[PDB]
């Protein structure tokens, strides 16, 4: 699909058997989701945003379905204003910016 | 052009006569540039994201050229680690997300 940017590029994703809304974020290196329980062991990590650094839980090799497209990678869980799908997963589904 | 996401989507922009490298960000509502003394009236504003909020100065109707594509709009200037071109300017250059 082709997505215009008049509205936030929010799409439905499936993760851990649950449905969630996430922003397709080209300005994010990583994928960060709001606090939720995910199967598997997690490692403490710190990432930076516009307002500073936050502590997150790092989950590896997690399958995520983005608008029907499959991806399996690192997912971070922590205090974020919105769920974001970063470049680590966007590259897996072949997402590109065009103009 | 078509931009892949293997690396951060950084491109050259021109604002206030200066050439800069900025991140094309679909996850940014606004365009935020690192500290620079632009002439003109501005209004104080607060924007947030991961880590919290930061204070920025809002400048309106500023001409910005993104990869040869002209645009004009609101630009925020504050203590940001990177220059970010948000949706307010991306829509003007007909930028879309494709996968």
């Amino acid at each position: 699909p082709q997505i215009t940017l008049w509205q936030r590029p929010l799409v439905t994703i499936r993760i851990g058997g649950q449905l969630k809304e996430a922003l397709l974020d080209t300005g994010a290196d990583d994928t960060v989701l709001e606090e939720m329980n995910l199967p598997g062991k997690w490692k403490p990590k710190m990432i930076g945003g516009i307002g500073g650094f936050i502590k997150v839980r790092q989950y590896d090799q997690i399958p995520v379905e983005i608008a029907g497209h499959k991806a399996i990678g690192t997912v971070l869980v922590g205090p974020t204003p919105v769920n974001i799908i970063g470049r680590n997963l966007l590259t897996q589904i072949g997402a590109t910016l065009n103009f | 052009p078509q931009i892949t996401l293997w690396q951060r989507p950084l491109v050259t922009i021109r604002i206030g006569g200066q050439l800069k490298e900025a991140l094309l960000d679909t996850g940014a509502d606004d365009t935020v540039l690192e500290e620079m003394n632009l002439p003109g009236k501005w209004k104080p504003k607060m924007i947030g994201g991961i880590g919290g909020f930061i204070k920025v100065r809002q400048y309106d109707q500023i001409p910005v050229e993104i990869a040869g594509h002209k645009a004009i709009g609101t630009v925020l200037v504050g203590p940001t680690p990177v220059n970010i071109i948000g949706r307010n300017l991306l829509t003007q250059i007909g930028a879309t997300l494709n996968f």
Partner: peptide, 5 residues
């Protein structure tokens, strides 16, 4: 990682 709200 820049949302910007």
């Amino acid at each position: 990682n820049x949302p910007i709200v």
